Amino acid sequence: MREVISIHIGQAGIQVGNACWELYCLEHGIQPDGQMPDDAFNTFFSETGAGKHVPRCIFLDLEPTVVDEVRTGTYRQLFHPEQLISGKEDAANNFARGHYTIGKEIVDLALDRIRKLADNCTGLQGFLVFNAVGGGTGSGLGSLLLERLSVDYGKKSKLGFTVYPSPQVSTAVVEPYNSVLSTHSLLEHTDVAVMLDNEAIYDICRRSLDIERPTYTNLNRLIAQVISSLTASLRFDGALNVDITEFQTNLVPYPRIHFMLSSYAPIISAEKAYHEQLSVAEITNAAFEPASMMVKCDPRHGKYMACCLMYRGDVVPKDVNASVATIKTKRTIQFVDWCPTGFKCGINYQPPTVVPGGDLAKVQRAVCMISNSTAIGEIFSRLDHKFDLMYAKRAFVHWYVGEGMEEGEFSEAREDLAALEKDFEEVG
Amino acid sequence: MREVISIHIGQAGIQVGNACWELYCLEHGIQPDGQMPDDAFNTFFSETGAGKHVPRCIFLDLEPTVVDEVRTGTYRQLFHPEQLISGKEDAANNFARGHYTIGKEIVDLALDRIRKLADNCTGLQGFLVFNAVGGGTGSGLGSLLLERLSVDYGKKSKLGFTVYPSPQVSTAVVEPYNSVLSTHSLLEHTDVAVMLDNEAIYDICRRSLDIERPTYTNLNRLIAQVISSLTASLRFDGALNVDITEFQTNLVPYPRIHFMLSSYAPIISAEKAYHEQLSVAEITNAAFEPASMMVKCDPRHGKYMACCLMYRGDVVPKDVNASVATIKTKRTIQFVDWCPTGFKCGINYQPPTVVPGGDLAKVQRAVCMISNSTAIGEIFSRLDHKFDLMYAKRAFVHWYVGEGMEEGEFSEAREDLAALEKDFEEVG
Amino acid sequence: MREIVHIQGGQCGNQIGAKFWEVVSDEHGIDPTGTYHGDSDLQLERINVYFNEATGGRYVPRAILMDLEPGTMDSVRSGPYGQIFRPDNFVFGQTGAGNNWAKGHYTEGAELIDSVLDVVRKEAESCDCLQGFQVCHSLGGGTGSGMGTLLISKIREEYPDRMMLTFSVVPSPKVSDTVVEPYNATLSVHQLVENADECMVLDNEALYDICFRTLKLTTPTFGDLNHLISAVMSGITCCLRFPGQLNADLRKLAVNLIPFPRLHFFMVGFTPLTSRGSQQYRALTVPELTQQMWDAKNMMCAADPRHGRYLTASALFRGRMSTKEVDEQMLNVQNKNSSYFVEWIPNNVKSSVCDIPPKGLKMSATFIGNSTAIQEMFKRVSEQFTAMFRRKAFLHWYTGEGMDEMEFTEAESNMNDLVSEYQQYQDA
Amino acid sequence: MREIVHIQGGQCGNQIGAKFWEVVSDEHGIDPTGTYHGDSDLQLERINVYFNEATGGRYVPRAILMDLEPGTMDSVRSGPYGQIFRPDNFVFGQTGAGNNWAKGHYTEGAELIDSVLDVVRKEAESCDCLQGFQVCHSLGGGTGSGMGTLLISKIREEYPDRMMLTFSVVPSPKVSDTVVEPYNATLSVHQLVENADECMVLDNEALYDICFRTLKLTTPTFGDLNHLISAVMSGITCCLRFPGQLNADLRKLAVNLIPFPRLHFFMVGFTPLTSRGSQQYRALTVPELTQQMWDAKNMMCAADPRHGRYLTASALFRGRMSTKEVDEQMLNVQNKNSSYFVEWIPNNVKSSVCDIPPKGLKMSATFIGNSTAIQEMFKRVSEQFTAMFRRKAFLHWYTGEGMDEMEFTEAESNMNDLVSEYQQYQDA
Amino acid sequence: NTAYQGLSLSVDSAVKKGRKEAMERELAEIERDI
Ligand SMILES: CC(=O)O[C@H]1C(=O)[C@@]2(C)[C@H]([C@H](OC(=O)c3ccccc3)[C@]3(O)C[C@H](OC(=O)[C@H](O)[C@@H](NC(=O)c4ccccc4)c4ccccc4)C(C)=C1C3(C)C)[C@]1(OC(C)=O)CO[C@@H]1C[C@@H]2O
Ligand SMILES: CC(=O)O[C@H]1C(=O)[C@@]2(C)[C@H]([C@H](OC(=O)c3ccccc3)[C@]3(O)C[C@H](OC(=O)[C@H](O)[C@@H](NC(=O)c4ccccc4)c4ccccc4)C(C)=C1C3(C)C)[C@]1(OC(C)=O)CO[C@@H]1C[C@@H]2O
Ligand SMILES: Nc1nc2c(ncn2[C@@H]2O[C@H](COP(=O)(O)OP(=O)(O)OP(=O)(O)O)[C@@H](O)[C@H]2O)c(=O)[nH]1
Ligand SMILES: Nc1nc2c(ncn2[C@@H]2O[C@H](COP(=O)(O)OP(=O)(O)OP(=O)(O)O)[C@@H](O)[C@H]2O)c(=O)[nH]1
Ligand SMILES: Nc1nc2c(ncn2[C@@H]2O[C@H](COP(=O)(O)OP(=O)(O)O)[C@@H](O)[C@H]2O)c(=O)[nH]1
Ligand SMILES: Nc1nc2c(ncn2[C@@H]2O[C@H](COP(=O)(O)OP(=O)(O)O)[C@@H](O)[C@H]2O)c(=O)[nH]1
Ligand SMILES: [Mg+2]
Ligand SMILES: [Mg+2]
């Protein structure tokens, strides 16, 4: 009845997809062999004729190496090999390669799986994309999908968890190009767009979890926790249940402003949890701390157009009414005038689960926050600057015009990043 | 009662027959030695004076090198040697040698075997030809034989499962010649004529079951499965029993237009069955997919003058009543104006049986689709082209005029295809 | 006296008739051995209406089973209540029907009527006062329509003063389980208008909704569809069998419902009807049964009563009650929805009532209405007919049995003249 | 006689009713089986106001539970008193509410109304003398706001004479558990005014206070707040259900409380409210219950009566007492703070009283108040509506369902006109 | 019976349909027994 289709494009998307699809099969007792020893899993699975529970996800990539890992990993007994999609060559950080040339031959395949994965649902909440902007597959291909999606459904909601090219740390050199080219073609198609970044979650691993060896698995674990929190209202009971429909209407004021931030709390190891009682106020305080955010953006330079808090575990709704009151009274937290309102709070009776061999602890309370703050226009300006700093020299351009592109889309996508940016200040 | 005389001309005809008469003796429990440890087999057998069950078929061929294989294979205890007709010399891919020189001397023999076989059947539903257009035996002889049949019965129905010369993959050089000549003769004689093709079935074994080494022994198992689901109501119970008379009055609107496509679903291996549920809506969707056809035709280039479905296994008639409605909603699929009707359905409570050593897996549902669609006039039009592409050079013609033919037949065989090609346009 | 002889044409009519003889065999409490094992005498005072005595105190139904292709007649003999029929009450021929109304009514019909007439006469002479006949058609197939109407015109010219029912199952307006279906519809109706006295129409579609919404059935098999038809078919003759403070012979139902000799197409529904959950809560009163019967869903044929006005109607209760309530209920309904009826008829309902309830229930009902709504159904068929007859599709089959084209035109002119009659007395 | 039909729209409305139908169910001494197990005949005399007779001597509540997203209705059915509801008294749609008042009132509302009207009428006729309606709304959410008001408009145009109560829970002035709250608040207010007769307004904030200070609860959960609303809702109709030396129908509350057909928004409170400890010190006297009911804290509406002026008021006592005391008490208070009352009404209170107390208590009370102080509620909503409408934030959602901008303007003006009314008679 | 009336409210999946039909058959069996 309440079912979501989770897509994982690029390398990072299918990397966190390993964590999320490890958490879920653990949270619901699903064994790696499909089967478990009501509606508790329907959102994420499809019980077969007898016994097995197949996850309703889609792993897509052009690099064969990683999808071939889950093919041999312990979780090969879960996914129907119709879900795992691969490709001979890769995109190699070119937009056209993912978008113009290679993408067009395989979209007819991926879309043929969704039409085979959507009809299985009678109540489809909305798509759930896992992107990684800055590369060829993630940006190039992912953008090519959403167009094929919106022409198909349109009426359906499109949600996206895209990691974003950090300002400081950058493993690529060309990512400003395809990132800008991604943002243009996704905007008129995505309905809401969450954003995150590794560097922030790197610090998050340092300050609170206190680990000096952060690898990609840890970050992917945290994204599993966040999303496990968001979907609890879709797959569990609790006061003030939330669904995607409610979520998107009270969080996107204008069609363009949908780029949003995130945060999680508590983020605590086994020991400091033993020296802690975890009052609902402390958790909702850290949740609004700009350091606990998952993006290197400062919300204290803008105003929260809206916020959405999803709690977890043992919470009673007066405390939420109490804590949010304490916050709306402070001064560091700004809001825009036309919304004296701006909060959509939710509770769930189901506590957060922990993964054996994982990094977090067993806690009875947990809070996640998603805010749409106009201060987000800042990180969009750095990328606005790096493009022109390099597009003047026309560096690396021969690749793009050499793979079925032109200079126009460089200009075209450029203005929308100015047209978007001016809109982020008209709300002031 | 309800019995059918199954003929097998040519090599491919008796090749496939080695698989059909494999599935049948397995479907009904008949051991390879004629006897099992009513009306469940009489349709395909004839209980002898004591014990044995002889298959009511005829294996006819001019090449001795293949019939003598059944004469020594494990399936000799089934066949009384008088069934398996042979010949000293073959047609050697010449229609005239199969129709004018050699075939004229052994029809009267086989005509006696049918006469010795039609008499044992009380209620004869109809004949079941397995021609293989593209050789000398299947084309020259089969065409010569059906003339000898309609002059005896005429009113009786003559079916046909005739493979067709593929557009791309072709293992002969003159098959454009004989194929044309066969149709010019069978058309006014047969009353229904299924078409199918090799490469379209090669892909199915590649796309669906994913076997990288398909062999003529693999395709034959699929042609075997198609017929079992067709003849189920002839030998089983279940809702909406369909008989050959009930199968053709509502499928051939005009006397000329009787060529029709085919399909089948589900077509999957063992593992891809354990990550599935295979709803009645899934099967009826893949059945209508132009990729699941066994002919290299594009149904979306025309409409459906009529269609038909033969379900199997556990089905309730409301979902068929419902799923067919869903298909009548989509716009990709078309139907001619004068046919607002057009779904002759059928159910059988008997599931499809799997052959050991086979590639398919066990399922509780199956759908064989048969449709007379006006889009088939394209594969008809290719052979319209290659024939005149060579007959302009009078190439290979010296064989035909030397073997009791002349140019008259070529010209008269030409006009009929043109006249039949305007017919597929007169329906629009 | 008042005995009734029963005829079962076609496959469906042969199959729903299996249940009808299974229900009433239980109502009067006789065993599959044909031996009576009830308790009261009311099971015996009017048993002679449905049965003939036999040696050893056995009862066999006064039924006839006529159908080509004797395959299906073995099923009913295999079922639980097959052993009660006289094997002499079986007429069949080997050749199938082919859905060709012609051969079912011109060639092969002419070959069995001489036999069937020898059987219907043999038990029409087994009745002290034969009330009337009743058949079970299927206006789609060839047997039910073709043979059925041929038998009917034979009876009518031999038993003119008697009454001929017809429990015909009409085709569907949306779904189409055959292809030539409009041809079998119109050609049968052109025989029913002149050769019938009461002709109910019943469809599978409305019977699927009735099984889905109300009964909450997941998978309505054909048994359950045939199960409901069995219930209604019994409900008509409660007065002929059981006592009643206000009894209703069929001859009085016709005169209370048919102001003009041609408007004899009725519309039926059964009450009470509920799932196993709601049965725990719903209470059985006359109000419940009269509001559920007067509803526009229970009409088992696919027509909207609101688009017409009930010329007349009728209701048949059975169970201990207070006859005043049934008098005023139909007085209120006639007063509230005064638009849904005509003016030239002051009181346009009849309220029969029986004294003995069904087997396990305590109260029940049965609705019958000669509403002008049905005119939609004939409107639909007269389009599909004039669609293909405008293109002469499939018409070569029917001209294969000496039929002509005027026979179609006359049949079509007959339906329009009929639907024009339903409009005159529908003054909006 | 005096039967009452009950509605439950929205999540909260589906939730408070779970208590209201749980408290009442124990007052009249029936078990979750639906069987009565009390002691006195008094529970049986006026039981027919809230329940219906069922087979086997069971009672089911005359309630209707409408809510999109049926996920919540599974909870109540799994609740301790979920087995009493008629499963056909459940209507839902799979699509989420979205809280877009349009889709709740324009698109998705329109789909279910025809179903709901079939349910109300189904049990509207189950009443001999239907007294009136009563609902359970939620102005922030879109289910209650959209559909409920959409249903209300449908009820009124088919039951104009009966009286429509409303237990709507009002958004909070301080906390906003959603964002688009003021929008759906106004668009519902624009519908309540013309199609309601008595509309209580209650708010979770004052509910948190009453639970915090007086009852000394440590953790008010949603049950407790709903446990409170259950109590008041049970106190209102104690006259319609139990004896009373001064009984009070609802319609006599109506005329005695609204002087003008538009000043129909009330304010409530329950008495006595004591923790466990104070209960052993406090003594139950009429003076106790009236000062507490007259304090400005028990007002579950987030308004201060000291800032407005009581046009009318009322009190319902239950428990054996002396009617002179209640007569002079209301006369004392009417004298003392004679500035909080109006002049042009000489006596502006109605003191009803019941003979039957609550279940475990022996005395109790309940206050109703129509004071102009509530105009502060609608002014706060205005500033939030006009601010965002000044910016047209979140507005594309609403126009996304065919709406225009006039409906926002009119709804603003109508509330503006309404708050002006409450000012005229508020002469300070 | 109480399980059959607690399992209800929008049977959506094939497993739900199967379990509810199983409950129907169990009910028929015990009604025949009692
Ligand atoms: C304890 C109890 O009340 O159980 C009932 C029952 O709950 C319900 C749901 C029954 C039940 O029927 C069904 O569930 C059903 C399913 C598919 C199609 C038709 C029916 C019942 O089977 C039907 C059965 O009714 C009869 O036996 C009637 O007398 C009926 N009998 C048959 O049709 C019949 C024939 C052969 C073998 C078995 C049954 C009948 C109707 C017309 C004329 C004569 C007899 C009974 C009392 C019940 C069950 C067992 C649950 C209902 O059926 C009838 C016709 O009574 C469905 O709607 C009614 C309402 C009943 O309350
Ligand atoms: C031994 C004894 O007397 O204990 C009392 C009790 O001490 C107090 C504290 C009760 C108690 O109420 C609460 O604890 C409570 C908790 C949260 C919110 C509201 C109440 C009591 O539960 C409530 C309960 O009241 C009733 O039974 C009423 O008739 C009430 N019934 C219910 O609320 C109810 C419903 C379903 C199942 C069980 C109880 C009622 C209210 C409105 C309309 C009809 C009936 C009683 C007398 C008591 C306890 C048990 C402690 C109080 O409540 C009521 C409604 O009487 C709270 O303040 C009052 C004053 C009572 O003295
Ligand atoms: N948080 C997190 N980031 C990852 C992870 N794996 C990769 N990334 C980031 O993904 C970005 C590279 O994206 P790619 O997937 O290689 O680019 P692409 O769009 O797929 O194009 P190709 O590389 O040609 O396939 C890098 O910035 C990585 O830091 C992970 O496991 N967790
Ligand atoms: N599907 C299928 N096609 C086959 C098979 N064997 C042969 N064919 C095809 O049938 C055609 C030739 O069949 P033959 O029977 O050998 O030709 P012929 O009618 O006997 O004529 P002559 O060879 O001259 O005797 C070719 O297109 C083959 O590819 C088989 O086992 N399965
Ligand atoms: N209620 C019910 N209807 C059936 C059943 N079987 C067939 N029907 C319908 O009856 C029609 C077929 O008529 P049929 O008797 O099989 O063909 P005929 O032998 O030429 O008369 C079709 O419209 C079927 O859908 C059944 O078992 N139960
Ligand atoms: N007293 C009480 N109020 C509730 C409860 N649950 C939700 N509410 C309020 O109900 C509002 C949400 O309305 P909702 O019905 O869930 O959304 P809708 O489905 O679109 O109508 C929120 O503002 C909550 O404060 C509850 O359990 N008890
Ligand atoms: Mg990559
Ligand atoms: Mg050959």
Automatic annotation (TrEMBL), chain E:
It is found in: Cell projection, Cilium; Cytoplasm, Cytoskeleton. It comes from the Eukaryota. This is Uncharacterized protein. The chain holds residues 193 to 226 of 240 of the full protein.
